[PDB]
Amino acid sequence: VSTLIPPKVVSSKNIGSAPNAKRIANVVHFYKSLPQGPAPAIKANTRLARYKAKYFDGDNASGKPLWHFALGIIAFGYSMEYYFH
Amino acid sequence: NDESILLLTFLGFTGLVAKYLAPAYKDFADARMKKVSDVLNASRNKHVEAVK
């Protein structure tokens, strides 16, 4: 009876579609995300900070700390098993 | 004495504990962070083309 007009009705149509739900999701997931590894806090300073940078960081993550623990028992020979039970 | 020899022997054993002849858990871990890192490349990009 006349010229129908569904070419321009997306101003209220862009709310119910599924991609819009993902659209409003990931845009919030993007703006505050740190750009290039910023704010990594690589300078750890808490009590034994030196340990935090050699083995406690996790780059090595090997049996050295338990080796250090074992050597501590060895150095305590005349303190726990000798001169005492 | 005898006690000192035993500690030296286990240090050699601990030295052998160091090798494990290219330990599997080293490579078992090596397979992990690459697997962990790679999926984050795919997963984050998966929604990157969602807006694209």
mmCIF file of N, CA and C in Angstrom, chain B residues 29-45:
data_model
loop_
_atom_site.group_PDB
_atom_site.id
_atom_site.type_symbol
_atom_site.label_atom_id
_atom_site.label_comp_id
_atom_site.label_asym_id
_atom_site.label_seq_id
_atom_site.Cartn_x
_atom_site.Cartn_y
_atom_site.Cartn_z
ATOM 1 N N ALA B 29 57.203 -30.198 32.742
ATOM 2 C CA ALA B 29 56.876 -28.807 33.032
ATOM 3 C C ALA B 29 57.045 -27.936 31.794
ATOM 4 N N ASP B 30 58.088 -28.195 30.996
ATOM 5 C CA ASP B 30 58.323 -27.399 29.793
ATOM 6 C C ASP B 30 57.136 -27.469 28.841
ATOM 7 N N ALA B 31 56.502 -28.637 28.740
ATOM 8 C CA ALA B 31 55.312 -28.755 27.906
ATOM 9 C C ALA B 31 54.147 -27.951 28.469
ATOM 10 N N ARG B 32 54.186 -27.622 29.763
ATOM 11 C CA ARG B 32 53.015 -27.028 30.401
ATOM 12 C C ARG B 32 52.898 -25.533 30.121
ATOM 13 N N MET B 33 53.931 -24.742 30.434
ATOM 14 C CA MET B 33 53.777 -23.294 30.304
ATOM 15 C C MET B 33 53.603 -22.891 28.844
ATOM 16 N N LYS B 34 54.212 -23.639 27.919
ATOM 17 C CA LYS B 34 53.922 -23.406 26.507
ATOM 18 C C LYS B 34 52.463 -23.710 26.196
ATOM 19 N N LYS B 35 51.952 -24.835 26.701
ATOM 20 C CA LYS B 35 50.537 -25.148 26.536
ATOM 21 C C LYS B 35 49.664 -24.094 27.204
ATOM 22 N N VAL B 36 50.068 -23.637 28.389
ATOM 23 C CA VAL B 36 49.312 -22.607 29.091
ATOM 24 C C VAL B 36 49.371 -21.288 28.328
ATOM 25 N N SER B 37 50.557 -20.920 27.837
ATOM 26 C CA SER B 37 50.695 -19.654 27.123
ATOM 27 C C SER B 37 49.954 -19.674 25.790
ATOM 28 N N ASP B 38 50.029 -20.790 25.060
ATOM 29 C CA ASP B 38 49.470 -20.833 23.710
ATOM 30 C C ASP B 38 47.956 -20.666 23.716
ATOM 31 N N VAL B 39 47.266 -21.292 24.673
ATOM 32 C CA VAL B 39 45.807 -21.206 24.693
ATOM 33 C C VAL B 39 45.358 -19.782 25.000
ATOM 34 N N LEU B 40 46.100 -19.074 25.860
ATOM 35 C CA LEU B 40 45.785 -17.672 26.111
ATOM 36 C C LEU B 40 45.956 -16.829 24.856
ATOM 37 N N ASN B 41 46.868 -17.221 23.965
ATOM 38 C CA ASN B 41 46.936 -16.581 22.656
ATOM 39 C C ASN B 41 45.672 -16.861 21.852
ATOM 40 N N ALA B 42 45.203 -18.111 21.875
ATOM 41 C CA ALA B 42 44.013 -18.469 21.109
ATOM 42 C C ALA B 42 42.740 -17.959 21.775
ATOM 43 N N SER B 43 42.643 -18.084 23.101
ATOM 44 C CA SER B 43 41.395 -17.750 23.784
ATOM 45 C C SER B 43 41.129 -16.250 23.756
ATOM 46 N N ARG B 44 42.141 -15.441 24.075
ATOM 47 C CA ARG B 44 41.956 -13.993 24.042
ATOM 48 C C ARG B 44 41.666 -13.514 22.627
ATOM 49 N N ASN B 45 42.367 -14.072 21.638
ATOM 50 C CA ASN B 45 42.100 -13.714 20.251
ATOM 51 C C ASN B 45 40.725 -14.193 19.807
#
